[PDB]
Amino acid sequence: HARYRPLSLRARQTLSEKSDDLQYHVVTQEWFGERVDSFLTCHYPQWDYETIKRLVQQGHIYRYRKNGKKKFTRLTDRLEFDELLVVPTRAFWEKQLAPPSGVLEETDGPKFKLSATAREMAHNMVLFKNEHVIVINKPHGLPMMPTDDPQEMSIAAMLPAWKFTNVAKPVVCHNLDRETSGCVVLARTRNAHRMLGRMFVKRVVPNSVYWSFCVGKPTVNYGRVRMHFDITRGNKGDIIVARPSPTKTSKVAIAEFVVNASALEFGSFISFYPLTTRRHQERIMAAHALRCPVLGDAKYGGDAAFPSSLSLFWDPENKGLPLHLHHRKIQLPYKNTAGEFICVTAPLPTQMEKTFKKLGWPCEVDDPLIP
RNA sequence: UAGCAUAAGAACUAUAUUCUUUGAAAUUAUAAAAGGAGCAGGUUAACAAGCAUGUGUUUCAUCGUCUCGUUGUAAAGCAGAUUU
């Protein structure tokens, strides 16, 4: 909810101590030795153990031992005689600036019906599935989140389709562009989502690859690309200023590009291994840092991503050419029976398969750079 | 402020007494100042009851979209580097 401001540690402590919306449960003879978690579970049936643990471990719920200081306790610590246990209230969470933990609130929303054809499409889309995670081959044209036009299809909309024998639908762990296809990961459970979210933040060891067909050939076969973006809002779209040097408000974008095989100076096949997440880092780096736009990228390589070189295969005047960028070989923490991590791949889309076949290069090949 | 001068034989001498006289130093000492290399820290940054010019607005992030909007989070979150 709104009216929640970012608070430093001192500000949070000051607000917590000043607020009068606190309930003090006395520890009597009957609840002396009872554990904190059991006491809270008994006294707050409406709350969930997740909320209990979050509050206790983040300090929103504490105890006062008459010691002149508020002790912050673990869930496994025993209580004591004639001591207070301070717990906030709905008033504490709402009528002030301190935001609550993202569980205790009772927010809810409606549902949405899906057609049998859509469910079958989702089932065919699914690639890998276990008790924790799903990896699906998101197509080219479909978007991930709802578009500026509410009446449009989306992966978020289709999410309930692959709610296999689970009460709650999975949650997307990361998002792809509306023009890029390939693997996308869904966490089945909330704990799985929290654990797997640490993969998609900025990292130094690549775990996924992007196969791209780029017009032109970079001067070097393998290398690293680093660009600092200063995304800002514009009239309708957003401006993306890219610079080589850092800046206070800029965000870095790092990738490792390997030219798997280049036909000639006209076209090339590149693999991008990103160490960072930014709006359109792969496309921007291919277009500017490498000076080799993707074969279907009109947003950056306008009139240059559609070359007359491949007039025999693709019509240069057909601006609807799908982007020749494909997410592939996402590596997951979960291992297999052989002891090695699970690397889920996605088959190349129709256009990239056609281009590879026409150039004579094989399509189904294992990328050793992502073990 | 009233009281305090003066006094001649017993010979090293006894914890007892607050008296001989200061009531306002009207700062600025310390020379002055600017932006490759050296040392140190941090790299799990710094800031955050915010921001913008009384008003409008959640924070940070998941590679959305052309304003709209899904999800997580309220830190287990956010700069830059992660090489031998």
Q: What is the DSSP string of A241-309?
A: -EESS--SS-EEEEEEEEEEE-SSSSEEEEEEEESS--TTHHHHIIIIISS--BTT-TTTSTTTSS-GG
**Nearest nucleotide over every DNA/RNA strand to the A190 CA, judged by C1':** B72
Name the phi and psi angles at A211, rounded to 5.
-85, 125
Task: Tell me how the structure was determined.
Answer: cryo-EM
Distance CA A253 to C1' B79 in A: 13
CA separation for the pair A158, A172 (Å, rounded): 11
Please name the residue whose C-alpha is nearest to the C1' of nucleotide B67: A236
Q: Which residue is listed with tokens 């709650």?
A: A168
CA separation for the pair A340, A157 (Å, rounded): 34
Cα–chain center distance at A70: 37
Side-chain half-sphere CA neighbours of A206 within 13 A: 23
Distance CA A4 to C1' B42 in A: 30
Distance CA A208 to C1' B9 in A: 127
Strand partners, A271: A211, A258
Distance CA A95 to C1' B49 in A: 13
The structure tokens listed for A170 are 């999975």
Angle, helices A36-43/A49-58, rounded to nearest 10 degrees: 130
Nucleotides of B under 7 A from a protein CB: 47-50, 57-83
Instruction: Kindly state the DSSP code that residue A230 receives in the 8-state scheme.
Output: -
Q: Which amino acid, one-letter code, is at A327? A: H
Q: What is the resolution of this structure in A?
A: 3.5
- Beta-carbon contacts of residue A215 (< 8 Å; ≥ 6 apart): A266, A267, A268, A292, A293, A294, A295, A301, A304, A305, A307, A309
**After which residues does a break in chain A occur, C–N more than 2.5 Å?**
none
Are the beta carbons of A183 and A135 closer than 8 angstroms? yes
- List the beta strands (DSSP E) in A74-165: 84-88, 126-129, 133-138
Q: Is A339 helix (H, G, I), strand (E, B) or coil?
A: coil
